[PDB]
Amino acid sequence: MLTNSDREQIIAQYQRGENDTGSPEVQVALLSARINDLQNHFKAHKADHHSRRGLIRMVNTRRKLLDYLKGKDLGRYTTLISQLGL
RNA sequence: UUGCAGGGUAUAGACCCGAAACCGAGUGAUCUAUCCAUGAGCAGGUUGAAAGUGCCGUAACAGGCACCGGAGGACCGAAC
């Protein structure tokens, strides 16, 4: 998984405001970290379809938040995807 | 009966010539069959597999496109 410590590290890096932990930036960053970490699990467990269902839902949620953020403020979206390599 | 001569017969090549064979011991792989070692040859012209690289793409594999590469009891065709 991701520990509480590195989850809070990601939160702190992408804080738009003080202890917000809810903006599209921090949400997308946390989803990105979780997906990139779960890649390790699914390389060793290819037939884990029940877990892959949740990972696909993570991908879908990140895509929804990225499109919403792009439609809201395009500078923030172009900055966020550049930071996250998307 | 013993010689000598003659006719026949017996055993021997047994009137002469003639097999395809069978057996024994050698000679041959400078032809040819396969193999072993060690050398040599295959003008010229084609096609364009895998791999690779880049860009895109994918959550990631996947996938696409271009370039590139030079496979093959591959193709056309002399020597052979």
Automatic annotation (TrEMBL):
Q: Which Pfam families match?
A: Ribosomal_S15
The UniProt entry, under InterPro entries, shows: Ribosomal_uS15, Ribosomal_uS15_bac-type, uS15_NS1_RNA-bd_sf
Q: Does the keyword RNA-binding apply?
A: yes
Q: Which GO terms describe its biological process?
A: translation
Q: Recorded GO terms, molecular function?
A: rRNA binding; structural constituent of ribosome
* GO cellular-component term (any): cytosolic small ribosomal subunit
What domain of life does the native source organism fall in?
Bacteria
Q: Which UniProt keywords apply?
A: Ribonucleoprotein, Ribosomal protein, RNA-binding, rRNA-binding
Can you tell me which family this protein belongs to?
Belongs to the universal ribosomal protein uS15 family.
Describe the function of this protein. Answer: Forms an intersubunit bridge (bridge B4) with the 23S rRNA of the 50S subunit in the ribosome.
What quaternary structure, including any partners, is listed in this protein's UniProt entry?
Answer: Part of the 30S ribosomal subunit. Forms a bridge to the 50S subunit in the 70S ribosome, contacting the 23S rRNA.
**PANTHER family, sorted:** RIBOSOMAL PROTEIN S15, BACTERIAL AND ORGANELLAR, SMALL RIBOSOMAL SUBUNIT PROTEIN US15M
Name by which UniProt lists this protein: Small ribosomal subunit protein uS15
Q: Which organism is it from?
A: Psychrobacter urativorans
Lineage, broadest ranks: Bacteria, Pseudomonadati, Pseudomonadota, Gammaproteobacteria, Moraxellales
